[PDB]
Amino acid sequence: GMQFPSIEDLRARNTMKWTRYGQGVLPLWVAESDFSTCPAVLQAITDAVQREAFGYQPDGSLLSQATAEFYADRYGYQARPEWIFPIPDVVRGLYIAIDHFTPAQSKVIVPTPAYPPFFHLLSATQREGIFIDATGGINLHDVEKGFQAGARSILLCNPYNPLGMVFAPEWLNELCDLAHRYDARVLVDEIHAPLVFDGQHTVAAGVSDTAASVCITITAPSKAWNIAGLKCAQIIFSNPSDAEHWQQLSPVIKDGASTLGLIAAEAAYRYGTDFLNQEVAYLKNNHDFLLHEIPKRIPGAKITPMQATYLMWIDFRDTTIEGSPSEFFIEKAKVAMNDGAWFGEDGTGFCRLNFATSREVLEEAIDRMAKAVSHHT
Amino acid sequence: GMQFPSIEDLRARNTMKWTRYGQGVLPLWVAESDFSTCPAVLQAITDAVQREAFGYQPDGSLLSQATAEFYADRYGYQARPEWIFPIPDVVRGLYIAIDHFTPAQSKVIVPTPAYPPFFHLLSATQREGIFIDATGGINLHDVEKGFQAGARSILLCNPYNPLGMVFAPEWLNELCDLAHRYDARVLVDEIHAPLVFDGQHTVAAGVSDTAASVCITITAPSKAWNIAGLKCAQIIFSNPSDAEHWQQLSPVIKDGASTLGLIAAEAAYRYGTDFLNQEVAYLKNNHDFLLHEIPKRIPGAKITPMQATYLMWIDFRDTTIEGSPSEFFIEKAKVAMNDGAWFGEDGTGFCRLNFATSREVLEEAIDRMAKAVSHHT
Ligand SMILES: [Cl-]
Ligand SMILES: [Cl-]
Ligand SMILES: [Cl-]
Ligand SMILES: [Cl-]
Ligand SMILES: [Cl-]
Ligand SMILES: [Cl-]
Ligand SMILES: [Cl-]
Ligand SMILES: [Cl-]
Numbered sequence A, B: 001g002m003q004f005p006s007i008e009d010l011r012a013r014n015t016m017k018w019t020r021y022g023q024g025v026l027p028l029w030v031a032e033s034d035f036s037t038c039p040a041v042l043q044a045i046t047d048a049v050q051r052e053a054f055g056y057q058p059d060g061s062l063l064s065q066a067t068a069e070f071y072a073d074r075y076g077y078q079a080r081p082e083w084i085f086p087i088p089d090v091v092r093g094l095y096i097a098i099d100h101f102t103p104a105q106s107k108v109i110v111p112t113p114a115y116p117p118f119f120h121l122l123s124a125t126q127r128e129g130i131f132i133d134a135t136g137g138i139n140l141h142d143v144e145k146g147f148q149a150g151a152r153s154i155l156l157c158n159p160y161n162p163l164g165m166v167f168a169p170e171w172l173n174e175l176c177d178l179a180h181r182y183d184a185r186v187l188v189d190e191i192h193a194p195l196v197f198d199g200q201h202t203v204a205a206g207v208s209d210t211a212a213s214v215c216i217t218i219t220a221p222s223k224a225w226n227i228a229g230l231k232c233a234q235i236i237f238s239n240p241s242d243a244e245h246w247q248q249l250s251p252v253i254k255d256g257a258s259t260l261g262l263i264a265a266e267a268a269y270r271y272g273t274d275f276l277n278q279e280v281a282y283l284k285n286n287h288d289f290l291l292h293e294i295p296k297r298i299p300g301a302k303i304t305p306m307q308a309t310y311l312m313w314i315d316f317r318d319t320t321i322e323g324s325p326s327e328f329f330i331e332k333a334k335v336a337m338n339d340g341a342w343f344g345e346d347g348t349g350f351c352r353l354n355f356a357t358s359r360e361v362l363e364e365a366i367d368r369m370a371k372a373v374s375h376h377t
């Protein structure tokens, strides 16, 4: 089980999630969760503020060790802490990775539907994307065709949001062998890895010696422990040459993490596992509930079963809703989900629903939607 | 007057300042202050943590208005809030400014002695610096020669750290006219502007219509209110074309500010002025004390009177100390100051001393130095 603040206290968090839409609209959109903050993480932040830890980051951080120990305990990956480094956030890590660890101007394979900031990542790095369809899984043949068309890296979310997918180890093994044959890198975004509820996360970088060479692994405790605004993520290298190359970069390229964020992240990794296990159990139950009920109450809605994350991709193309389903549900049901068109052109007609909230909130949301949809124009 | 935490509580802040050197070494180096945090700022952070404001930043921020109102009240500059934007920190703003608002590969005039991160800024942007001597002030003839040698921007700290200088308005006016004649930008770093204790800060961007076009102004409350680790600074544009160009940049280029940092910065600007005035009065007194006593107790040390900042540039070249004076004082006096060689090659023999601490700490520090220096090898 999990604790939740009152709905009043949730709004009073005064984050993007609660300020984008009106007071009557239930927000099930941006990836922040509604769980009361993990007690160990909240206390670490509270104590740091009381201590006035507001200057520059201290020497002697054990965050890299904490990260390595978490990777070892949870996934059986023996990460080297000397190859783990702080960064402000996961997308900034991917930005540095493309800009400094792939050849200049080289195309980047981006599976779709894609985490919407990935399109901004392409514009920021000035790289052309090669888009491949990840719906129902990724075909390695599509990946090879991208490399044959000139791509020198692939961005791989694992777990794969917004589809809730957990890639198999032998699949990651062949992906890395393929990348190596084309002198390409695999940039693995593992921000959702703590949130697997049906299956097991495999760290791609550890499936082979080839994988260790081709992967650059990027993660944060920000999704699982809900501290995105504190700015602390981790870059996990799996070979000495990448770590050396990182160390040679100007500090200005690598800096940004917040002092409080370093403290919150370390506490999450060291003391947040019990909470994580309860969180994941609660998400699995919400998932099973939504998977059954949504199609029964909102006719034509289709959902594919998931294995990880709190983000549910719903197909509304078999409804007869006019225009964007997201906009319909905001205006007529007072329930906010992300419009799938932001994830790629083939996301049109889909919505992404955030189920990291209470069963009560989910019931209310689907009931509002069930009524509104019964007489949409 | 000002409050200070106990020396035990200062160490327990566990920031870079307190963790670089051993327990017996008084740290007067990195630019963090030892004042108890401004009560209004501390309470804003405390309340935000209690509210669990840990997700993404909210819509409807009034930080730009707060910044504009501070600029108006303190300096008489009527900044437009719609031209003010958040960034993670001041150096990141300068990085974006060089990379996106000056021509590709164009040289950058960097006065010396220089804030040490400026050398990392040059390596990160891949630009060659044209170094001019700022000791005793900046000669506009040296600036013109730089532009004639191809530079298309100048980095201008105003107030100028580490020399404590406050530039005159008619000087800023001619600098901007000069820059305009060479199609160059003036990138004004005003992070120390709240900390003028003898004179008045002029906002360069407001001295003329030409200045409004050529300047890009970058600041933060991080120095004056000691919140560098919270990651929130401001970019202040002074013409619509720059603001438009900023808005057209990929969000990935511009993001990074922390949620708590946005909250702390707004509180600093809205409610921190009384504290600021007491801080500045305390710094002026520390400055007057050090200016008189250092030369009397540490023979050969020379100091030029300052008008702003809490960073004192001390010349030890007329001592007969062997090797780096910074290293001598760390090893033999247990007092840590920055080695001037990090500020440029002509900084060798200088140290930078941070006097944003108690008179008690300063007395103890100069006394340790006075004894050690009496029999240096
Ligand atoms: Cl999101
Ligand atoms: Cl806990
Ligand atoms: Cl997503
Ligand atoms: Cl930064
Ligand atoms: Cl510093
Ligand atoms: Cl106050
Ligand atoms: Cl300085
Ligand atoms: Cl940042």
Ligand SMILES: [Cl-]
Pocket (backbone or CB within 6 Å): A088, A089, A092, B255, B256, B257
């Ligand atoms: Cl960022």
Ligand code: NA
Pocket (backbone or CB within 6 Å): A088, A089, A090, A091, A219, A220, A222, A228, A232, A233
């Ligand atoms: Na992150």
Ligand code: NA
Pocket (backbone or CB within 6 Å): B088, B089, B090, B091, B219, B220, B222, B228, B232, B233
């Ligand atoms: Na700053």
